[PDB]
Structure 1
């Protein structure tokens, strides 16, 4: 029922505790959404669970924005 983009943004929102209106595709986890170093790791783990996937860390270090989180899941 939910799109991939919706599922990714929902999790970013719940994990960083921000309003869905703030989860902009250009938002940076750290600079914009105020993620600390643990938050981003917890964020990735939550993405692995939602989409039942594994994220090699070399890719995971590239997931620093909303768009980047979507792109990994997307293959985009």
Structure 2
């Protein structure tokens, strides 16, 4: 598990890193897209669509709208296959 959880977390960590132009180090489970990563309302939408496609999942808006830190999206990704 953990080994796979770390693998998954990294997966997502890298996607966020290249996308927002921030170092992986700053992309921690608890860091925040807006507050700490300089992202914006649409930045996150681009990110959600990318992750949705990559993993073949559909994150309901009721869930998406609650994403603040990267740990949030990691969990929502499991909550869908």
Same fold (TM over 0.5): yes
Which structure has more helix as a fraction of its residues? Answer: 2
Task: Return the alpha-carbon distance in structure 2 between the equivalents of residues 13 and 63 of structure 1.
Answer: 17
5+ residue gaps in structure 1? none
5+ residue gaps in structure 2? 1-5
Task: Supply the RMSD in Å over aligned alpha carbons.
Answer: 1.4
Question: When the two structures are superposed, what TM-score results if normalisation uses the length of structure 1?
Answer: 0.88
Task: Return the alpha-carbon distance in structure 1 between the equivalents of residues 10 and 56 of structure 2.
Answer: 16
Describe the superposition over 1:16-47 as per-residue Cα deviations: whole angstroms up to 9, x where unpaired.
11111110111010000011111010010111
Q: Which has the larger radius of gyration?
A: 2
Aligned residues: 74
Structure 1 ranges of 4+ moved more than 2 A = none
Greater relative contact order (Cα < 8 A, sep 6+): 1
